[PDB]
Every structure is written in C-alpha cells, then in structure tokens.
Amino acid sequence: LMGGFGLKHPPPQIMIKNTPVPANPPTNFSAAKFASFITQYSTGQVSVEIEWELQKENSKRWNPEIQYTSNYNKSVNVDFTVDTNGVYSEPRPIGTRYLTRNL
Amino acid sequence: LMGGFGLKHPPPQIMIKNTPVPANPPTNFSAAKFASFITQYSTGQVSVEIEWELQKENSKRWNPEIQYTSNYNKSVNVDFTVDTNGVYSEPRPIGTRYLTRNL
Numbered sequence: 001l002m003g004g005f006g007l008k009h010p011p012p013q014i015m016i017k018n019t020p021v022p023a024n025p026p027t028n029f030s031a032a033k034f035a036s037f038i039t040q041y042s043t044g045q046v047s048v049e050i051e052w053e054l055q056k057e058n059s060k061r062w063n064p065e066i067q068y069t070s071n072y073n074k075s076v077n078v079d080f081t082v083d084t085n086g087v088y089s090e091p092r093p094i095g096t097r098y099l100t101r102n103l
Numbered sequence: 104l105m106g107g108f109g110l111k112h113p114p115p116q117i118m119i120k121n122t123p124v125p126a127n128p129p130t131n132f133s134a135a136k137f138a139s140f141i142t143q144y145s146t147g148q149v150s151v152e153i154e155w156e157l158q159k160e161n162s163k164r165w166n167p168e169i170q171y172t173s174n175y176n177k178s179v180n181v182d183f184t185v186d187t188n189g190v191y192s193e194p195r196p197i198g199t200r201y202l203t204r205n206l
C-alpha cells in the first residue's frame with residue numbers, strides 16, 4: 001500500500017557486522033565474558049545490478065501525450081543537482097504515470 | 104536554408120493529368136484543333152511509405168532533459184485535434200531540438 005511490487009520471496013536481507021577483536025586479556029583465567037574490545041569500524045564498496053523488464057507503448061493516440069520535462073526558465077540552481085555547498089537535492093517527487101491508455 | 108535535407112537526387116516529381124476526351128467532332132473534316140472537350144475530373148487514393156533511420160541518445164547527463172509535453176490544464180479544445188466543426192488545427196510549430204548534447 002505504499003507502492004511497488006508485492007513479493008512472497010523478496011530480495012534477501014544482507015547482514016554485515018565487524019567480528020569482535022578482544023583487547024588484552026588478563027593473565028589469570030576468568031570465566032567472565034569480555035567487555036573489553038578494540039574499537040574499530042570497516043568501510044568498503046557495494047554494487048547492485050538489477051535487470052528491469054519494460055513494456056512498450058503501443059498507442060494509436062493522435063495528439064501528443066504529456067511527458068515529464070524540466071522547466072526551461074533560468075534558475076539559481078539546477079533541479080536534481082548539487083548546490084554550491086555540495087549537497088544533492090531532489091526538488092519534487094516524480095511519479096511514473098504520464099503516458100495514457102484506454103480502459 | 105528553410106530546413107531539411109539537401110539532396111542532389113531528391114525524390115522524383117510525380118506528374119498526373121486527365122487524358123483529354125473530345126466531344127462530338129464535326130461530320131466534315133477540319134484541321135483545326137479541338138477546343139471541345141468533355142468536362143471531367145478524377146479522384147483516387149495515394150500512399151507514401153518512407154523509412155526513416157534514427158540516431159539514439161547515448162547521453163550520460165544526470166539531470167532530466169527537457170521534453171515536448173502537452174499542457175495538463177483543461178481547455179475548450181484539445182491541441183492537434185478537430186474542433187466542433189470538424190476542422191483540424193495545429194496550435195504551435197514544433198521543432199525537433201530538445202535533447203541536449205555537449206559540443
């Protein structure tokens with residue numbers, strides 16, 4: 001009901017964590033659990049490649065259909081673009097429904 | 104300079120006319136040319152099939168390009184459509200230049 005594709009077997013969950021690295025243990029055995037860990041984090045790269053199937057417009061409609069277009073008028077910032085401070089921004093939500101079909 | 108494709112061998116000219124049909128000649132030979140013809144016209148059907156080759160957009164442009172779109176707002180008549188009296192009309196000229204490329 002928010003939108004999209006209901007799936008019984010959706011793309012799986014990818015889980016990740018940093019393996020614990022203990023700090024120096026005591027020199028006499030104690031069965032208590034370690035609260036002492038080396039503070040660390042990890043970084044890396046992630047790629048996602050999805051293959052989307054398309055359904056083409058077959059319409060016989062004579063007159064021009066609405067399309068999603070960028071405003072031609074000048075502006076301080078360009079839409080869907082970084083600003084002077086490097087911050088990416090999306091000015092408006094874009095739905096997918098423009099082309100028209102008959103019932 | 105008006106536009107389009109300069110051609111040294113452009114599509115040929117297709118010529119058509121109605122073959123003359125004389126009216127009743129005199130019964131005594133006269134070498135004068137006939138000014139007397141049966142008034143007639145012809146109608147028919149004509150088909151033109153042209154095969155146009157296309158050059159696709161390869162652009163890496165991030166932000167959305169301008170497109171030619173129909174106005175969403177309501178109106179008495181729809182653009183590029185017949186009116187109540189059956190008259191087809193084109194409200195505006197449409198150029199071909201929307202998509203953007205670099206120099």
Ligand SMILES: Nc1ncnc2c1ncn2[C@H]1C[C@H](O)[C@@H](COP(=O)(O)O)O1
Binds near residue numbers: 004
């Ligand atoms: N989002 C979504 N996911 C899964 N199943 C759905 C969904 N929406 C509807 N349905 C069900 C009920 C439809 O009549 C049928 C169409 O399946 P068809 O493939 O068109 O034969 O599938």
Ligand SMILES: Nc1ncnc2c1ncn2[C@H]1C[C@H](O)[C@@H](COP(=O)(O)O)O1
Binds near residue numbers: 109110
């Ligand atoms: N409209 C038109 N018709 C015919 N010849 C033209 C036209 N415009 C330019 N030219 C000539 C001059 C260009 O440098 C060359 C490009 O041919 P190319 O095919 O790109 O190698 O062809």
